[PDB]
Amino acid sequence: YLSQPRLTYKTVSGVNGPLVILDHVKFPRYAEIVHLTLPDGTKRSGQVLEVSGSKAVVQVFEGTSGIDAKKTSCEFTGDILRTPVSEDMLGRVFNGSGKPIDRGPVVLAEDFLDIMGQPINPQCRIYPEEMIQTGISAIDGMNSIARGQKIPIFSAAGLPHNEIAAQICRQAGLVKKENFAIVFAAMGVNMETARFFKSDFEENGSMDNVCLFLNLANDPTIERIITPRLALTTAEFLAYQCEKHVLVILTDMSSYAEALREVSAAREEVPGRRGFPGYMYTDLATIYERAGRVEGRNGSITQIPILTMPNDDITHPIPDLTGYITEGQIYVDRQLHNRQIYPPINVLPSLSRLMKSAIGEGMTRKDHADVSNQLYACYAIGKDVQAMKAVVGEEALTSDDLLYLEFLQKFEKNFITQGPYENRTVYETLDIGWQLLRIFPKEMLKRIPQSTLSEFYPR
Amino acid sequence: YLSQPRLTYKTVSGVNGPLVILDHVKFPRYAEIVHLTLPDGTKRSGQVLEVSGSKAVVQVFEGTSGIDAKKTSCEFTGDILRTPVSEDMLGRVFNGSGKPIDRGPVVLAEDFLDIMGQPINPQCRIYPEEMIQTGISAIDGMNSIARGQKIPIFSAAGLPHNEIAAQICRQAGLVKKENFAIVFAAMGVNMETARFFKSDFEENGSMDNVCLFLNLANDPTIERIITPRLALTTAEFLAYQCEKHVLVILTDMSSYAEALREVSAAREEVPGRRGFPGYMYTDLATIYERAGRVEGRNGSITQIPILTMPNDDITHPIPDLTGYITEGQIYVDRQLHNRQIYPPINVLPSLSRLMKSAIGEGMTRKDHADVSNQLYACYAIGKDVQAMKAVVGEEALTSDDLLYLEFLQKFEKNFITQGPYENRTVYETLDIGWQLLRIFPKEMLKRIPQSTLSEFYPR
Amino acid sequence: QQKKIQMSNLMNQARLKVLRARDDLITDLLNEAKQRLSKVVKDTTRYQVLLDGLVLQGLYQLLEPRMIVRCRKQDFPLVKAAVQKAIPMYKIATKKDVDVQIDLEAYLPEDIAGGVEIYNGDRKIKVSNTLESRLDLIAQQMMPEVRGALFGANANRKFLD
Amino acid sequence: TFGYVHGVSGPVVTACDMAGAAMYELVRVGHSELVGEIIRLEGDMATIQVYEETSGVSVGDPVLRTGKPLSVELGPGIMGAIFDGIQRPLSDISSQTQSIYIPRGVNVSALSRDIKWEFIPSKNLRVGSHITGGDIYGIVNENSLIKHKIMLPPRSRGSVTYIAPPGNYDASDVVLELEFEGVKEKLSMVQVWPVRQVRPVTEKLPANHPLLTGQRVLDALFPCVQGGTTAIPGAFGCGKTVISQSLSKYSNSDVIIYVGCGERGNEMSEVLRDFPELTMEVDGKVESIMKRTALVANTSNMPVAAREASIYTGITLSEYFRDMGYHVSMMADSTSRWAEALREISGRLAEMPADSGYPAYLGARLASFYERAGRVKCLGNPEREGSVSIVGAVSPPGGDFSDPVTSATLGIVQVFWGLDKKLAQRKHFPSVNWLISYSKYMRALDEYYDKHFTEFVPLRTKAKEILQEEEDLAEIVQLVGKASLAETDKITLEVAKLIKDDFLQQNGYTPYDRFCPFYKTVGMLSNMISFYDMARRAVETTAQSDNKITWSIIREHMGEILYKLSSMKFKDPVKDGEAKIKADYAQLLEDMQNAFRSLE
Amino acid sequence: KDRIEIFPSRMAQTIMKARLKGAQTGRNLLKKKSDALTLRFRQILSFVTLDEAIKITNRRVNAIEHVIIPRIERTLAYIITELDEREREEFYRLKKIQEKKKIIKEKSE
Amino acid sequence: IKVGIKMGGLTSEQYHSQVVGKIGYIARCMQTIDPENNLKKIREDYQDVLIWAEKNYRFEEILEASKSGKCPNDLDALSRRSLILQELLRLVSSISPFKMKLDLIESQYEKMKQHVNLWKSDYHVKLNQLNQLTDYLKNAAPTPKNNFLRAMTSVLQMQIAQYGITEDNEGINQLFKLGLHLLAMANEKIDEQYHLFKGYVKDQPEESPFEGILPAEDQKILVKTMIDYAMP
Ligand SMILES: Nc1ncnc2c1ncn2[C@@H]1O[C@H](COP(=O)(O)OP(=O)(O)O)[C@@H](O)[C@H]1O
């Protein structure tokens, strides 16, 4: 029960950016928590980043402004930030540090969990299978999502990634032949977006099963490093102890990665690509992999994190390292957005690793796998046709190129374009798929076995 | 004044590149000047760029070759580089260190001014509202020069930017239908360039109103970043204390930037682009912004900080950061020079920020602004037509396109081509404008209202 | 063309000629000032007072625990007194005990009009407070006023900024 | 109460014997008492960011420790005044020092204490009344345009014990006395607020009202809203400063705070000369613009550290007026110059840099700056509604929108007004790219537009489709040579030119394009789109007949209509009012319809 | 417009260099087609169809030469410059890291 | 565990401080609008707020009551309840010379209270238009324009006092349009000022629209101004 009084120090060595360095500390514990009382009485908290001898470096979440080097009192908790968690956290809004913002009380500690995460034994991990029917043809048709997957949405600044994520949340469900709890971690989100999501959950009547963690763009930038760990810790309680199915939305891992960069620079760490810490891979893996099913439980965690891509690229370290950890992506593009297409999802650079197993006879439709592959290849070819047309002109194309060009134009208009308040089923999506495939003569559909064509193609 | 004896030290701690580090210094002053004598009697000077406790870091102007560690004798002047200034500096030739090189005496000061200068109070700065007649149609018409404006000529190695500057020195007058004191900073140039200007100033019969500062290619590279400040400091004395109108020309500013980059590398400062210091903009502003009229005083400073563009790259940091600070640029290029066009001034990528106030009723002629804007439209379109015709051929053009080629061809030989001694008035330049604009029918002159065309177009 | 470039050269040289003459006049004044200071130095009753100040002045600038005072031998009896009367004052103005010695082996050149130079213990830090050094140190700062005082103010200067 | 200077590296000064000093406290460095702010604490030594040139500062110079953080004085006397980067009035310096240069170490009150202000209380308070933060207990008549509300500062409350009767009071007197628990507070008209702290509001509201801009583009195609944030990352010569000046001169905002952070010195003089000569009628009376504007000058050749203080002073001033129920539209014409200051200081600090030398926390500073914008419900019992908009320029090197500042800015701001250097070279002003720009407030304003106009939205959509289609064609036309174009495509290409040359560009230095009332923009757009639809119909209904109306036929037949359409800009809204302009545009529509009937 | 607008990378260098080689090969093959048509055209002097085929071929060749390749070369040069700029900022940080390590080592002695 | 609650958007202490003010504000508004406590229906509707005011309470005691939950401490709900009263106060005060019947005041209260968003409603816009007219005239020279605005504004105030602002009565609608147009009209353009005023007077159905609205002394100046204008 740690019934041992805590030591409080005024032995501040110095303060450098977001970091406070203390000396003369008795047996510093790594990743311990320190409560700081500023000379004016303001309380703030921080977590130890490293210890050495009698010195410790504390990462202050709310910020270091106003801290002096003589009077600030630093109380060492003696433990690791184990956060209070409760099943009744749903229907609540918390700030980035897990404190009430909704005029409710402090969450009552039904239990405590170490936010660092408790690794799950791969031997007991259960492979996900059941498909989530998101309502979005670009996802349910081609890049389907299994329950327990990890499929982030890439986007650049200005794109409607908040609308797609909101659409998935309210349209989420299973392929039918009861619903998800939402754990919503906002990291560096502006107020206009914050009310967009909050209002959407209220208007659809979802708040009974929604827990928000709001770290806004105008809130402290160090705090958001823990926010996603608090969000997933609650998800793990609800999914693995309370047998709920939880959908976890992380509004931006890029502002999270930047927050890590701010700390990494502050402690004069050796960076890797573009100034980010060499351990970014691990810091992301320890959050992304908190997903999936485990033997003996009925609940699950599905993650759909969002990442803003600097400079509209996908080789930036942030999306690059994420791609190596997560199981595909959605990739929201800009060329489709500029053409007033919604959802503006580009099917070519986007994949879903679990798609090959979460579909097919017994889960969706016999032809699901064949329709997806053929449409993808046709789209890829259509794009190569446009690349030629841009040089040789529309008068220099052959009959097959025109069929691929007509397919491409109709594909985006009839298949990808949907609208934010219309959901289509996986079976309706495939029926549309066939309407687009039937543009081609059967001889050109080289990626669909003849048996499938004879059953579906002439319909 | 400073009555206390200055101290002399033999306490040099060490030498690292161009920086001589002293210890045991009594109350070091930041940005104070140190005079040092080498074991062989050579005298050199430098400035303290850093102080810490008893240590001071001195950047030596002449260089650090031959600086000893035990026998080096240094003395601290006790002030910043304040330089002697007097009215009778006009007609004198100085080096980049402020010393005479014309076999005359040292400056018999009327006062001592801080070489760093002071920012002019923006509330007392008076916005320029007078035009200078350069006599060059390519400038007076489409990119007018105001008195108090900062207008560099962007050039490239081998182009006659020295001849244009020399021309401007002789035939720069007023459009009020005047003797400018010229302060010429010749830095980073060869003997022939400095002798060219020196000879031209005597040939013009104006040498008694010209002050030269020379710092040649074979002179120290550290003095090359105070020479502009020496020129401007004198200009400030003449303009703001003696109400003399001064024209300040700084030769290839790129030698300033390169000298600064060497200092930045030596001091391990944060680079921005192409290895230049991240504060290059701020340093340039210190040089450039020493210009303009001041309310209540009858003087002015006009600058022409000509610069060479490395590899004709208009986005190189030197022309880029200058473009952000100065009121536009004249810009010469090789496409005009390679056709024996003089002056080789290309109006399309050029502008004058103060030009809009300078033209029009009460300044030149009421149609000035309209003629300039339409000439820009017609010239740019003619360039676009050439880009088209280069591929499609003359047969693919219609009468609407050939007119712009006729304009473009006549414009460059009638408007831009003049000759080193062709001095046109601003009114003659506009008349030429109309002669070229009348190539097109009224309907195509879309930048000019009918309230102007009906008066001027018929002629 | 040839006539006006020749007249330009002639006018430019005439300007340099009068400027050099003006500088000669400034030098003559400074050389007279040097002789006037020598005449003052010859007066024991005023020179000893200068030395009293000059030694203490240098001591305040070094603020070292050990001082070596160097002078020309001819004036040693007066520098000795200047030091003796300077230490009680130093220990009051700075609250620091200083060991002040006079160098009896090294002397300033005999052609120095007067004054002292003071070295710290290791001879790495020195202050030069002789009469020639003071004359130039001040004259170079007062020159703007000398220029006006001898030749008149510049009628074209209106502002002192 | 003093420390001592230990070392100087430029804008950064290191001081010792300051064990009790806190971060972001003000200090006075040197015998001239230069203003600085503590950045780091290392034992008993402090790292000080100094907002004035440190030349001449010596080791051992005193450092005065001031408990108050960097703060701005807020009260009457701001409007019409120009301040430096740390809220020192330039008109008071020049009137007191008689110099033309700004001296270093000047300690001048931000708001004059000699002026006798005309003060009227709210007449709703009594002794014993309970007053809370944000309450207004009187108004000062600064001028005829802005009524200056005297608010109780945030984090202050209590019972009223005395309220000054109406009369003439200066800023050193006591207007309100209030007590809480024994402790009594005496307040004048001037409150102090740290510039780095966000002033608290009751609720941040969605922005649902246009920010009127005197531009055709930057309004019809890419609207900005009251409380919104936008960026203008223009290259040098793109005319982004002119866009900022145009918005300041001619908008529907109540107060403009213009921040010249790293700007050319001539630009601030330009404003001070021109603005007093502008008019804005209030209630039938002609009044100057300066009475509703204020500006901060921290020019490019001024201390680089002061660029951070300038930005925060500007937005803090903006919030102050927001709290009084006014709509504020401040603009800082640089952003990159602020981030540049952060880079230079970070270098002197020897910090580990991030992307392209900029501090890792660059994004943190920009995010917290821009989020202080927004339409809000104010604190205070009187239930005020206000806004702060931020229109911030950015200066990407080379015009390449890839630097950390442009990139981070685009991830924060909701309206992107991208400028194209290649359009500025053609004097196609404003140089708006119109292909990469966007506004995320289109949906927010759709309700507004339907309420007042209706016709605007389908016209906006058709205009974007025409411009985008022209770009899609231009890509291939460059290679084909206009040989394979259909007649329906040639109409698009030439109408798109009509839009580009006559609608998207305007000369802001003319009596007719200096301000473009919205009714004129949508009026002339309706005509241009109506031509498109009628011309496209003319060929669509005849292409399969016994005579196809090609562009060359309509071009020669209707050449007078094409000239009239191009003339629609030359309407001079000040001389010819709304009634004549609308009637004129109606006539052009009739002329087109009659010419088409004779053509088809 | 001026550049293909591919974000600077070593991958972009490989793609752009392959794209440039392709454009240059197409330019040379089409130039040979034009020369063959021009010789046949002059031998004949189905005549106007050769003049039309030559005009179309030469127009495409001119576009490759005046539009597409210059644009690839500008893009490639842009990429090369920006990559060296990224190399420099890495050099700076690594140099400062080495100096900070040296300072730590001196303090330890 | 309360290091940083940031309740809604305010520090807890600032949130509760705002609650104390709003309670006092409503009490002040009720005493200002209804000095005699005649509006029994509305005072009862605020009884749960006014019970904490009009009594010898200290500021700290009400602040404690908020923190302890002993008073209506829901600031967002309390703000809505305050606004539907603030707008009623300015409605009555802006027409001071012409008092509303108590039945009309209570009717206007309910009409605003039941509105989904009073701030953005037509009630607020009409009140803003009225205050633009009545605020201008607080300090104005006795010019033709200002004498016409005085006469026309008094009529507008009279009609509002009779009908209120919930019904789109043609009388107040025309008066708003003409009043705002005349006020906007440039001060020197007297010919339009006289045209608009004279056209108004002979467009109203009343033989003498100002009879009993403004005093005889203002009627004498009002008519004399028109007489002088038409004299030459
Ligand atoms: N909207 C505009 N209307 C008319 N002229 C303009 C406009 N914008 C820019 N210009 C012209 O081009 C110049 C460049 O604009 P400026 O704001 O100085 O460029 P920058 O983008 O560097 O701030 C202006 O001084 C003016 O002459």
Ligand SMILES: [Mg+2]
């Ligand atoms: Mg600008």
